[PDB]
Subunit: 50 residues, 4 copies
């Protein structure tokens, strides 16, 4: 209903898209980076044994 209905719906959809964009950053960049760092830390501690 002019023009706010389009505007209010458009604004929520815009919020949701920015959050999902952040979630895809967390899952495809941040966490994979955290797991790589964790692997090598532990991998180093284990090789530190022999």
């Amino acid at each position: 209903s002019p023009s706010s209905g389009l505007g209010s719906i458009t604004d929520l959809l815009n919020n949701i898209l920015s959050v999902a964009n952040q979630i895809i950053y967390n899952s495809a960049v941040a966490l994979p980076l955290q797991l790589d760092t964790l692997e090598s830390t532990l991998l180093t501690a284990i090789k530190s044994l022999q």
Copy 2:
């Protein structure tokens, strides 16, 4: 169910999306830290 209920759906989706931010940016990273620490101690108990 006019514009209002669609606005409820949107709020429900936004709220759930927020929970997913918590899980992925807070809970999982913290779980990984706790795990890293537990294994680090155990490996270290082999050393000394």
Copy 3:
């Protein structure tokens, strides 16, 4: 109802599944990874006391 209502219902549905994956399935895999590794390390100690 309806096209937008249908799309939104789908999105929500995928979202609830993402909540399960990230709050239940992944933490379970992390716990099991921890358990499995601790067990490898530990059974190794138990293998020290002999030979």
Copy 4:
């Protein structure tokens, strides 16, 4: 594009759907694959002292 197509709204819903899907793949498949690859690497590093 004709107004009947809804314009702003329709593209947003498609993007959010596309992203949600990629998030599903990352949490259900990619991260699990990386976790398994991690566990093997560490186990193999342990297997190599034994």
